[PDB]
């Protein structure tokens, strides 16, 4: 990852409680950096382990993927979390 991506990832880890509001199933179809195999894996993960544990798995999966920060920003806006999107963007460019 880039300096920007790492910095963004740490912001996310540090604001666990804000990001925990994300509904995994709702956000997945918007995350274009995930492959369809990635999405299948993550849905099956949700079914078994529920939203919170899957969120953790979702973020560590994301940062293994090219351009995940922008993928996440777009998805957050689509999931009525445009405020989180704006903070993620600001950190990434900070």
Author numbering: 1 to 94
Question: What text appears in the publication on this structure?
Answer:
Recognition of viral RNAs by RLRs leads to the activation of mitochondrial antiviral signaling protein (MAVS; also known as IPS1, VISA and CARDIF). Activated MAVS triggers rapid production of type I interferons and proinflammatory cytokines. It consists of an N-terminal CARD domain, a proline-rich region (PRR) preceding a poorly structured middle segment, and a monotopic transmembrane (TM) domain at the very C-terminus. The N-terminal CARD domain of MAVS is necessary and sufficient for forming active MAVS aggregates.
The positively charged residues R37 in the 3rd helix (H3), R64 and R65 in the loop between the 4th and 5th helices (H4 and H5) from the CARD in a lower layer (purple in Figure 2B) are in close proximity to the negatively charged residues D23 in the loop between the 1st and 2nd helices (H1b and H2) and E26 in the 2nd helix (H2) of another CARD molecule (cyan in Figure 2B) in the upper layer. E26, R64 and R65 are highly conserved among MAVS molecules from different species, but D23 and R37 are less so. As an alternative verification of the key residues for MAVS CARD self-association, we searched for mutants that disrupt the CARD polymerization in E. coli. They can be mapped to the two interfaces identified in the cryoEM model.
